[PDB]
């Protein structure tokens, strides 16, 4: 079912954790909530589910106002962040509890519990109580209990966080294929970037109780609307360099790099509310920086940290007149020493630009995969 939040506010006395949030979640949409640890993602889920009171504003589920509706009557199932497994019941009993409460046939109960247990790789653990399980197994029991129930609105709170990489990939495929089969509304909370990019129809980025941006995965990646979102979507983080504006066109902004040589570059970025002389923040992603031999704009500094990841090498470079180290991603194993001089390229069209107030100067370079 559809989920709508109109001006939803949540307060714990004086501590406000949701400030006039407006979200429109359509039927069959896969929505992913991301945001820093402590920004109010679970709070929102618990307000939808009816486990938390709504201070002011309106919650709609299936076009119906649900503020004062009891949790059972909301058509909502949740994978709790803390799992909330019934400690006295076995895995099988946990996953089949809701169907037992309802008027479900014993045969249908045993059918879907088995099938869901198979894909979750829990079939050998059916008679176990939660205490005789590992943390990741417990998490999968929590997922399984909701999958078996098949509610109108699925709420998942960081459900893959304690699973190994290989298994995380497998569960991700399962949830996605369940989304296509049933065509139901799913609201998914995660810290994992791969999950968010691959599963979402749409991502909601939350920032200290406010909605920072709502958009398609690639839209947020290529076109973040402010400095917060830019630095939050994509990991390792976007690099940020302080620059000064030297000239503007409607179509572009000329900035001066902070290095002693004061190199100047035209960026295909909007100049709306951009003044000559203003102090801005240039953004450039580690993956988007170029090898020095194929670049016009050259940034040179000293290697501070080298991280060997097998598939790739991440090199942290300290550049004169820039406080924060620049991070650079390189394919394959690259054997660079700490202390070595290292140069990289700064490509104008992949550069982001942020005003003093943090808002993004909208990028005008057309990037593939975005309509």
């Amino acid at each position: 079912a559809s989920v709508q939040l109109q001006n939803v506010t949540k307060a714990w006395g004086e501590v406000v954790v949701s400030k006039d949030i407006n979200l429109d979640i359509h039927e069959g949409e896969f929505v992913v909530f991301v945001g820093p640890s402590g920004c109010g993602k679970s709070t929102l889920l618990r307000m939808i589910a009816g486990l938390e009171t709504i201070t002011s504003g309106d919650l709609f589920i299936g076009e119906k106002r649900m503020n004062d509706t009891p949790p059972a009557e909301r058509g909502v199932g949740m994978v709790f962040q803390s799992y909330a497994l019934y400690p006295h019941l076995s895995v099988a009993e946990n996953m089949s509890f809701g169907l037992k409460l309802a008027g479900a046939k014993k045969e249908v109960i045993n059918q879907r519990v088995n099938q869901v247990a198979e894909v979750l790789q829990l079939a050998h653990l059916l008679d176990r109580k939660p205490k005789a399980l590992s943390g990741g197994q417990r998490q999968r029991v929590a997922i399984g209990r909701t999958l078996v129930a098949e509610p109108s609105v699925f709420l998942l709170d960081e459900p893959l966080s304690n699973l190994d990489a290989a298994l995380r990939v497998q569960m991700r495929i399962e949830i996605s294929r369940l989304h296509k089969r049933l065509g139901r509304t799913m609201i998914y909370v995660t810290h994992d970037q791969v999950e968010a990019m691959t599963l979402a129809d749409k991502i909601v980025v939350l920032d200290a109780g406010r909605v920072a941006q709502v958009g398609k995965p690639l839209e947020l990646y290529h076109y973040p609307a402010d400095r917060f979102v830019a630095g939050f979507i994509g990991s390792p983080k976007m690099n940020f360099l302080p620059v000064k504006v030297t000239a503007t066109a409607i179509d572009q902004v000329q900035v001066e790099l902070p290095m002693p040589n004061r190199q100047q570059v035209w960026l295909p970025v909007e100049s709306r509310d951009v003044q000559v002389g203003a102090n801005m923040s240039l953004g450039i992603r580690p993956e988007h920086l170029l090898p020095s031999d194929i670049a016009d704009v050259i940034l040179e500094g000293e290697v501070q940290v080298v991280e060997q990841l097998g598939n790739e090498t991440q090199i942290h470079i300290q550049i004169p007149s820039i406080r924060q180290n620049l991070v650079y991603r390189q394919n394959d194993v690259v054997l660079v020493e700490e202390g070595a001089t290292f140069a990289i390229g700064l490509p104008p069209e992949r550069c982001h630009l942020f005003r003093e107030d943090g808002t993004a100067c909208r990028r005008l370079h057309k990037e593939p995969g975005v309509a």
Binding site: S82, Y83, Y86, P87, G98, K131
Partner: protein, 286 residues
């Protein structure tokens, strides 16, 4: 090192607290009726135990004295009265405590305080009111009137206020996300109570059963007031027959006192399977 010192200090404590009880046992195995003497009686007699177990005693001059009282029937009456009333007390106390711990209603804190306060009133003239009540009650509902086990049981069901607080307090230790998960699973407040909360609160239910069972096994005044027929007596009531203005039949009284401890012991042992650690383990992360 800590194990050795604990065992020794426990054994000495056990020895000290068991001593008064071994003297009770001694009184029950001593010939005639004597409240004092040696720990092992100088003259041992099985007669007090013979009479309490339904056996006929052969006295000094050849005469066979039949058991004056049905002591074992009294014990069975005690078990039925104590058992049914402990069940009733657990049933009324848990349901009550569930509302007080999970549900909202006007004057919740006032009634809780009032319950505790009104139970603290001295029961000095309580028997007069109780007799009037059950005499009146009996002409309409016979099975809970005067001279019935039903009536005695019914009268014990009022002593719940403390058990309500005890169970309420235990309910409040269980993480609230479990009943949240149940409510989302579609459970009613009743189903979440029965299928989630009660199985996890099982240790405090055992305590309430044990304490109510004990209070009922040892209860004299109310049961004596209500019961008339010798065959309907509980043991606590029956054993009063051994007590006279100038002398006690100490041997028979002691034998009865040891017997009344047996159902208590058995109930305490059976309750251990519900008195377990780790019931909420693995449920909630945190």
């Amino acid at each position: 090192a800590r194990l050795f010192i604990t065992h020794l200090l426990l054994l000495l404590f056990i020895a000290a607290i068991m001593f008064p009880l071994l003297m009770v046992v001694a009184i029950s195995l001593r010939q005639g009726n004597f409240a004092t003497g040696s720990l092992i009686p100088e003259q041992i007699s099985w007669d007090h135990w013979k009479l309490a177990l339904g056996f006929s005693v052969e006295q000094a001059d050849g005469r066979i004295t039949p058991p004056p009282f049905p002591v074992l029937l009294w014990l069975w009456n005690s078990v039925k009265v104590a058992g049914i009333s402990a069940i009733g007390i657990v049933a009324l106390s848990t349901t009550c405590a569930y509302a007080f711990a999970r549900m909202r209603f006007p004057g919740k804190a006032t009634l809780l305080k009032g319950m505790l306060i009104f139970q603290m009133f001295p029961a000095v003239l309580s028997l007069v009111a109780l007799y009037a009540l059950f005499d009146r009650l009996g002409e309409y509902i016979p099975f809970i009137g005067l001279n019935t086990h039903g009536g005695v049981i019914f009268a014990y069901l009022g002593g719940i206020a403390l058990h309500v607080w005890t169970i309420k307090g235990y309910f409040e230790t269980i993480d609230s996300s479990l009943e949240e998960a149940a409510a989302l699973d579609g459970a009613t407040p009743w189903q979440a109570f029965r299928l989630v909360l009660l199985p996890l609160s099982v240790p405090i239910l055992a305590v309430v059963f044990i304490l109510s069972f004990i209070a009922a096994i040892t209860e004299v005044p109310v049961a004596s007031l209500l019961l008339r027929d010798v065959n309907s007596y509980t043991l606590a009531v029956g054993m009063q027959q051994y007590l006279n203005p100038q002398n006690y039949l100490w041997g028979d009284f002691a034998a009865a006192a040891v017997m009344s401890a047996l159902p208590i012991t058995i109930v305490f042992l059976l309750a251990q399977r519900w008195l377990v650690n780790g019931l909420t383990a693995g449920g909630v992360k945190g």
